[PDB]
Design an enzyme around this catalytic site. Structure first.
Site, short mmCIF file in Angstrom:
data_model
loop_
_atom_site.label_atom_id
_atom_site.label_comp_id
_atom_site.label_asym_id
_atom_site.label_seq_id
_atom_site.Cartn_x
_atom_site.Cartn_y
_atom_site.Cartn_z
N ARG C 171 0.79 -1.21 0.00
CA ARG C 171 0.00 0.00 0.00
C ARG C 171 0.82 1.26 0.00
N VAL C 172 1.89 1.34 0.83
CA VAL C 172 2.67 2.55 0.92
C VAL C 172 4.08 2.28 0.48
#
Lengths: 116, 120, 303, 101, 265, 48, 120, 303, 116
Positions: C171-172
């Site tokens: 996600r990041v």
């Protein structure tokens, strides 16, 4: 039809019908070839394949993660965009063009991009 | 070099003399023969390669000596020995058919076949 | 390295392996083998994380790999069942969501105020049959950010490590990546999720446009492959990915892609390791670095 | 992928029209006296030929037509609740009249 | 249930798999005969072509087409259908004679003027001279075949035994035969009916060859298709099998929970 | 009658002494009904 | 075995018959002991008990036991919890096949199903 | 015969049938009928077994047919649950395996020291929906040494006996087969195997190999039909199979198989009841017997 | 074949096999269709459809749940009538002329009724 209007409701009816058909023929599609699909149905399937790709719209918070710049498409624009697709106007250009893009106009521009 | 063929099977598609029944009467082809096209009529055909002779019963077709001395014989079906009484009974029935009557042509053809059979 | 539910033998091979690669001096091993009792196994990740927090609270960056929480689940299940708590879904106790969340959320990169500490947590979940609807796996997916799904069919078919990009997300992750490997590798993830789409209807009809992509895609897949226990330099990864992204792998026949990599790296080092030092320190490809590399890649490709 | 024979497609064609006939929008009840005609038309295959898209149009219009001329007929269906010979004939003629236009 | 609905579907896929296997084997059996026929047919045609070559003959336009009367042939029907439409941009008025239900339907939709003659019952059996001949005869009577100074016939040439390429060829016309550059090297009568006969004779003989090529492509294509079918069905078996297996375990678990709950009470 | 129709009928007759193969007989028996197609439309499927 | 290995220094090989029946037997003893049966009936103490058995089996610096176990996958399912636990312990798999024996191949060991994590 | 859960009316039919077939002159019927109490039902195979021990112990032989232990299981279930003993899989007792295993190992052909005796056994298990995975079947399948797997489809398809011989297996099997019958039945096993494989090709355009298999297989399948409650003497089993092996039945059309069988038997008795008696008494086929038998079959086959 | 005797049994045995064949073949008909399926098999299939609907006969107490009055067809007569069907003595009778009617006499009568 009394909320978002008869035209919206009509547009939605067709979207549902096309997609329901498309899901229905998933068995046949797998067991045999897609060419072995009935020709009339094959048009519906091709339209639905396009509809499926069309529905992906880049998001602005996702824009970071996907890398694709976000797209916020007006509601008024949306009804038009799908309406056109239902009238098969822009059904004449690749599924790849429909994939991950905004409004109908954006698809047209992306067709030119794709053509390059 | 003879090319004798049927759709069913090839027959010779070297061969010294071939004797053919054509709308131009009977044609015999021996070595260099000038290049012709002939309608083959319902026929009795003899093929001789050397002195060995093989006898074919042929349902008509087309014959064409090619200008390279290749005798293309093409016909729908054929040996004479394979064709060779019950058919004479059938042909009698076919005479009956002429009485009523494409059926007219058919029955006429049956009479032609009766002649062709009689030749055997 | 937290080893839960692993044989004392297997761990002994791992330890020896680590000492073969002389990695012990930078690593800790905490151990809770299969022989070790189930309550010890239940408490095994939690204790390990305390040790990690001291490093984190020294403001230093660290990593903790909890292999495998699935065996922690069985342990907590055993304990819970023997405590006669009513079974949950899949017989895993009802407080299992809490169990994993309590473990996982103790790791993180602290605020600059609270120091530079980070505890990188990558927990290794052992899916039997790749059951990604299964309760223990799904709960972990929901807790974590990314996933690194590994496909057996592909693993068997020599993609080691097999990375099913369809089921791998992070996600990041992308904003932690060094800019050099962001630029050179830019959109390649998208491209090979076009290779995936393309090859979906490749096996229906095909067109030359899709085929061109397929030829690129298949060839890129060849590029991905690695040989286990052989790590790569970050600097070295920048050119290989540059080559493929810039489509120099239509320029290399599919068979020779593996050859190309080794030879290319050797070429680069011999020709000019100056470039590699530059992208290594700059950590970005300036127009000059980009050109030097463009030139270098063309140069190797030709020979 | 079974290639249907014409006899099966007579059924199929008839069948499709019935399906379109059934549909009703939410919160739109109908009067039974005017549901009897619609079924008469369908079952007596008068809609079989009529193009699939405009079945809904036919339904709306047919009802309007029955309201216009054969409003006597509707009153009778309310009054007697079983179709008489006269009603069947009237209904047959009316239905026939509306197949085209 | 989940379990039962899975299981019945898994059984369905299994039965489908078995059928696609069976068909594929039977197709191989049929294919041997089809190919054997095609050799003999092709040899026969070649002799007629020998005349046409030496003759250098050089061909409203008529279109005749040949495909299967029934599906599960592969994409023979629609690859030809597309290629007819393409050559119907090469003539906007031609009369299409469709030998084969599968090509018949598709072209019939696109131009509902052009379909003038059509046949039905050819494809079921392997090609026979009798059928071809009668169609030729009907082509002459119904369509007045000689009148068209162009005729072209469509079929699927089986390029390789894993492929089929929709193909066309030009059937020579009797007007053409007369005036063909060579027709004089060949010698025949001045009372000759040779144009009116030779045209007719090759109308059928060429047509039969085209049928033999087409039929062979149909049988070849179905073998390919049914093989690919078997693979796709297999994947579906594996997917429902995993679902079945998981579901079976799950049923046991769900029953157990009821039992535990009861025991606790 | 058509010349090639003439030859055809003769061939069918000629398989009649007899000793003949089933495949010959199959080759001499038709199995079709030609559907004449009007302009869309279609006169009756006369047995070919 | 351990007396042999540890106290006679021996290399030993210990066969076990069905370890399905080892698991099955343990599952029963739990149920009798009144412990809550876990997934697919199996004992809550399934893993640990197998663990003791398959960690006692080891190579010491004195000798080594080695163990060949027989795994009958129950219900023909390799997705059941008991197989999973077994496979975790397994280091190699020998996959005897009767198809292979029918090809006259004795040993009956299936070549492409025999795979080992000891190959490297 | 151990009639477990069999309604008293059913057992009355059984008794009558046995008397009709003059068989109570060796039969014992231990009966725990449907209404009979669940302890009696529970102990019913155990009780029956004890009767068997007397014969077995005396060195006599006997056959105990437990029909059906599936209903015995249900009774133990009733007891355990009512006695509040801890439940187990499919709500069947935890030690149900232990019970069945204790019972089924009592059967045995005793040692030479204890004199040759036996207690052959034939447990019958009822499949609830063909569920071989079901707990009571799975357990029993494991315990047993062989299975006969009767399939309903075959019954409907008029194969009576409706044994699916594919899913029948025998442990000891052909080791205790009649030696003669073994000789003339290697072929039979292979033929039926082929017939199974070539079964689906019968939906066709038949290949010569396949159609030959089909002819042999169909006649055999018809031959293995036997009208219920008619056993056939072994000295007459051996001839019928010999004919099939020599493929002489292939010529005989399917409808005439039935007639062939009885006729062949009558022919064998008239022509050569010397052969039949030789088969019975010699018990082992010899080249001369097989020679003569083939000849006799050919002559019969002509008629 | 003892209780109701060999004839009754034999007639019913043939019926059971016939119906089972039709069911087994239904899958073949589903994909393969009438093609590589025997002519003999096809006649058996046709007979099974006739038999299937010959088993259809109304109930007197379903004159309110249908309207056709039921038929108490004598057992001996039923054995005979079904025997006829198997022999194919009434394969000229429509499938639907077996549907929802009594004995053979009725089946013939409904054949005539349908014929008109």
């Amino acid at each position: 039809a009394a909320v978002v209007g008869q035209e919206h409701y009509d547009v939605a009816s067709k979207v549902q019908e096309t997609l329901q058909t498309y899901k229905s023929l998933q068995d046949i599609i797998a067991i045999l070839g897609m060419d072995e699909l009935s020709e009339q149905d094959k048009l519906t399937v091709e339209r639905a394949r396009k509809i499926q790709r069309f529905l992906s719209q880049p998001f602005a918070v996702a824009e970071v993660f996907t890398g694709i710049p976000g797209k916020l498409v007006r509601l008024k624009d949306t009804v038009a965009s799908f309406k056109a697709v239902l009238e098969g106007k822009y059904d004449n250009i690749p599924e790849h063009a429909f994939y991950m893009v905004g409004g109908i106009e954006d698809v047209v521009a992306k067709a030119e991009k794709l053509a390059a | 070099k003879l090319q004798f063929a049927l759709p069913h099977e090839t027959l010779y598609s070297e061969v010294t003399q071939v004797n053919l029944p054509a709308k131009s009467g009977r044609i015999g082809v021996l070595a260099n023969h000038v290049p012709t096209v002939e309608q083959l009529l319902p026929g009795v055909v003899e093929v001789m390669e050397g002195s060995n002779s093989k006898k074919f019963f042929i349902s008509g077709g087309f014959a064409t000596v090619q200008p390279d001395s290749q005798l293309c014989v093409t016909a729908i079906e054929a040996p004479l020995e394979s064709f060779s009484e019950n058919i004479k009974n059938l042909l009698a029935e076919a005479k009956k058919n002429v009485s009523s009557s494409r059926e007219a042509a058919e029955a006429a053809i049956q009479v032609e076949v009766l002649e062709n059979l009689q030749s055997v | 390295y937290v080893a839960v539910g692993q044989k004392r033998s297997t761990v002994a091979q791992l330890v020896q392996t680590l000492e073969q690669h002389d990695a012990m001096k930078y690593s800790i091993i905490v151990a809770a083998t299969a022989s070790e009792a189930a309550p010890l196994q239940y408490l095994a990740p939690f204790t390990a994380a305390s040790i990690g927090e001291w490093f984190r609270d020294n403001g230093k960056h660290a990593l903790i790999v909890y292999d495998d929480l699935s065996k922690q689940a069985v342990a907590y299940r055993q304990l819970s069942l023997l405590l006669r708590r009513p079974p949950g879904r899949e017989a895993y106790p009802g407080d299992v969501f809490y169990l994993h969340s309590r473990l996982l959320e103790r790791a993180a990169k602290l605020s600059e105020k609270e120091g530079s500490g980070s505890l990188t947590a990558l927990p290794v979940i052992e899916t039997q049959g790749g059951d990604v609807s299964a309760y223990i796996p799904t709960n972990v997916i929901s807790i974590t950010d990314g996933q690194i799904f590994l496909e057996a069919e592909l693993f068997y078919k020599g993609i080691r490590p097999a990375i099913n990009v369809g089921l791998s997300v992070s996600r990041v992750g992308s904003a932690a990546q060094v800019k050099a490997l962001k630029q050179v590798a830019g959109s390649l993830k998208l491209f090979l999720a076009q290779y995936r789409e393309v090859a979906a209807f490749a096996q229906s009809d095909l067109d030359a446009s899709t085929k061109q992509t397929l030829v690129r895609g298949e060839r890129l897949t060849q590029l991905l492959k690695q040989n286990q226990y052989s790590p790569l330099a970050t600097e070295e990864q920048v050119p290989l990915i540059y080559a493929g992204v810039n489509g120099h792998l239509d320029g290399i026949e599919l068979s020779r892609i593996g050859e190309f990599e080794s030879s290319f790296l050797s070429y680069l080092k011999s020709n000019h390791n100056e470039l590699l030092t530059e992208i290594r320190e700059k950590g970005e490809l300036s127009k000059e670095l980009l050109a030097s590399l463009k030139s270098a890649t063309e140069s190797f490709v030709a020979t | 992928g079974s290639d249907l024979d014409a006899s099966t497609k007579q059924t199929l064609v008839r069948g499709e029209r019935l399906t379109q006939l059934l549909k009703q929008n939410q919160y739109s009840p109908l009067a039974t006296e005017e549901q009897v005609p619609l079924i008469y038309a369908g079952v007596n295959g008068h809609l079989d030929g009529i193009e699939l898209s405009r079945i809904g149009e036919f339904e709306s219009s047919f009802l309007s037509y029955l309201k216009s001329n054969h409003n006597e007929l509707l009153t009778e269906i309310r009054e007697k609740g079983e179709l008489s010979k006269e009603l069947l004939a009237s209904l047959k003629s009316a239905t026939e009249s509306f197949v085209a236009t | 249930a989940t379990l039962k609905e899975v299981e019945m579907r898994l059984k369905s896929i299994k039965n489908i798999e078995k059928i696609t296997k069976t068909m594929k084997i039977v197709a191989s059996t049929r294919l041997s005969k089809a190919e054997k026929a095609k050799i003999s047919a092709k040899k026969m045609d070649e002799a007629e072509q020998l005349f046409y070559k030496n003759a250098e003959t050089k061909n409203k336009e008529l279109i005749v087409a040949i495909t299967s009367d029934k599906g599960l042939c592969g994409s023979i029907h629609s690859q030809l259908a597309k290629a007819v439409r393409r050559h119907l941009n090469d003539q906007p008025n031609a009369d299409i004679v469709t030998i084969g239900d599968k090509i018949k339907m598709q072209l019939l939709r696109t131009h509902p003027n052009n379909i003038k003659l059509s046949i039905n019952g050819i494809g079921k059996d392997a090609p026979t001279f009798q059928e071809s001949a009668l169609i030729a005869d009907k082509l002459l009577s119904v369509m007045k075949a000689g009148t068209y100074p162009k005729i072209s016939i469509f079929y699927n040439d089986p390029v390789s035994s894993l492929s089929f390429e929709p193909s066309e060829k030009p059937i020579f016309n009797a007007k053409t035969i007369e005036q063909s550059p060579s027709f004089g090297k060949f010698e025949i009568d001045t009372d000759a009916n040779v144009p009116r006969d030779l045209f007719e004779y090759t109308l059928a003989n060429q047509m039969l060859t085209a049928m033999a090529q087409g039929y062979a492509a149909e049988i070849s294509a179905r073998r390919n298709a049914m093989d690919n079918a078997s693979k796709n069905a297999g994947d579906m078996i594996n997917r429902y099998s995993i679902l079945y297996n998981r579901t079976r375990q799950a049923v046991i678990t769900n029953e157990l929970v009821d039992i535990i709950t009861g025991a606790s009470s | 009658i058509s010349y090639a129709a003439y030859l055809n009928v003769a061939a069918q007759a000629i398989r009649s002494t007899e000793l003949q193969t089933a495949s010959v007989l199959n080759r001499s028996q038709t199995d079709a009904f030609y559907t004449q197609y009007k302009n869309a439309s279609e006169p009756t499927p006369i047995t070919k | 075995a351990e007396y042999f290995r540890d106290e006679e220094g021996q290399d030993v090989l210990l066969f076990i018959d069905n370890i399905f029946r080892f698991t099955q037997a343990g599952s029963e003893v739990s149920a009798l002991l009144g412990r809550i049966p876990s997934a697919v009936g199996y004992q809550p103490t399934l893993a640990t008990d197998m663990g003791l058995l398959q960690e006692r089996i080891t190579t010491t610096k004195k000798g080594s036991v080695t163990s060949v176990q027989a795994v009958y996958v129950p219900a023909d399912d390799l997705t059941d919890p008991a197989p999973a636990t077994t496979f975790a312990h397994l280091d190699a798999t020998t996959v005897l096949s009767r198809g292979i024996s029918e090809l006259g191949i004795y040993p009956a060991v299936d070549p492409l199903d025999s795979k080992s994590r000891l190959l490297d």
